[PDB]
Amino acid sequence: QKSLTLIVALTTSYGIGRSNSLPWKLKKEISYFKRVTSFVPTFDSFESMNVVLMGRKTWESIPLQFRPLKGRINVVITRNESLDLGNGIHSAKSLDHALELLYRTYGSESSVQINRIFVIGGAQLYKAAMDHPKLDRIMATIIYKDIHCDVFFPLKFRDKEWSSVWKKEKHSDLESWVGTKVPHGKINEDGFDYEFEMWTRDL
Ligand SMILES: NC(=O)C1=CN([C@@H]2O[C@H](COP(=O)(O)OP(=O)(O)OC[C@H]3O[C@@H](n4cnc5c(N)ncnc54)[C@H](OP(=O)(O)O)[C@@H]3O)[C@@H](O)[C@H]2O)C=CC1
Ligand SMILES: Nc1nc(N)c2nc(CN3c4ccccc4C=Cc4ccccc43)cnc2n1
């Protein structure tokens, strides 16, 4: 069971969504998201691919022109065996089942190898990922504007109460893990000030 990575864009009040949608239109954040979930270190095996895990509500909210996230192995978690109708859209009862589907489906008899696993969201899938003993990384984008949302991140990993578990890494570590250079400091895109951060937990 490889390490799990959580990627999220949230306000300072931990808000992450409004009405099954995003209360903001950031063009530079979305590019970060894609490169991060799509990047694979050269040294790893040649047929290495990434996986993005997502909840059901998060998958139905992505416009058909966008989903499924290309260049990545897509898995939808659902406590319901319903029709996904995909080009191979895997679905599992939980994080642990999803990981089991991957290892079984992708391995020796595969011409496709699993690289990094990303939990791309959904409040409910976040809490599950936060409770999992394998999550160890959190790629966070902080919107410095207390926008009005109605969906929030479960754990306040940036507050004091958790400061002994979650440690924010320097930007040099944030860039190396991503293999490329990324904007250091605030970024003001259309009256929004946000920045990238990477937090690591001890296992
Ligand atoms: N800003 C950001 O970074 C992100 C924001 N979002 C936002 O999140 C909101 C969607 O709401 P939310 O309901 O929280 O979305 P979720 O992605 O958490 O989806 C929840 C649904 O996913 C399945 N699911 C979730 N957790 C589990 C679990 N632990 N075990 C098994 N199955 C599970 C369910 O199946 P079932 O339906 O069958 O019960 C459940 O109804 C939207 O506003 C969306 O835009 C999403 C991703 C990123
Ligand atoms: N850093 C980071 N982390 C995330 N988890 C993340 N989630 C999203 C969510 N969004 C959604 C969500 C709800 C409604 C619309 C919509 C539109 C487009 C897309 C496209 C691809 C993936 C998500 C998504 C956006 N930006 C993110 N940034």
Domain count, the chain: 1
200 burial level (CB within 10 Å; 0-12, 13-18, 19+): middle
> Which of 12, 125, 139 has most ligand 1 atoms within 8 Å of its beta carbon, as the pocket-test mutant?
125
Instruction: Give the type of residue at 61.
Output: S
Beta bridge partners of 72: 50
3-class DSSP assignment, residue 160: helix
Domain span including residue 81: 1-203
Provide the residue count of the chain.
Answer: 203
CATH code of the domain in which 81 resides: 3.40.430.10
Strands 193-201 and 166-168: antiparallel
Buried residues in 163-190 as b, exposed as e (16+ CB within 10 A): eeebebeebeebbebbeeebeeeebeee
Question: Is 60 a catalytic site residue?
Answer: no
**Active-site residue, 4 included:** no
State in Å, rounded, how far the first CA of the chain is from the last one.
Answer: 14
DSSP-assigned beta bridge partners for residue 76: 54, 91
Calculate how far, in angstroms, residue 8's C-alpha sits from the geometric centre of ligand 1. Answer: 13
Resolution (in Å) of the shown entry?
2.3
Residue nearest to atom 3 of ligand 2 (CA): 8
CA–CA dist 45, 177 (Å, integer) = 17
Angle at 134 between CA 105 and CA 79, to 5 degrees: 60
Ligand 1 atom closest to the Cα of residue 95 is 30
CB 73 within 8 A of CB 92: no
Q: What are phi and psi of 201, to 5 degrees?
A: -115, 160
Long-range contacts of 31-40 (CB under 8 A, 24+ apart): 32/141, 32/182, 32/196, 33/7, 33/9, 34/69, 35/178, 35/180, 36/7, 36/118, 36/139, 36/178, 37/7, 37/69, 37/72, 37/118, 37/120, 38/71, 38/72, 39/178, 39/179, 39/180, 40/115, 40/116
H helix intervals, the chain:
27-38, 56-60, 95-105, 123-131, 171-178
The ligand minimizing its distance to the Cα of 75 is 1
Residue 93: both structure tokens together: 């009862």
Q: Which helix (H) or strand (E) holds 168?
A: strand 166-168
168 closest CA partner among 157, 182, 176: 157
User: Determined by which method?
Assistant: X-ray
Q: Of the candidates 92, 96, 68, 70, which has an alpha carbon nearest to the alpha carbon of residue 82?
A: 92
Q: Which atom of ligand 2 is nearest to the CA of 140?
A: 1
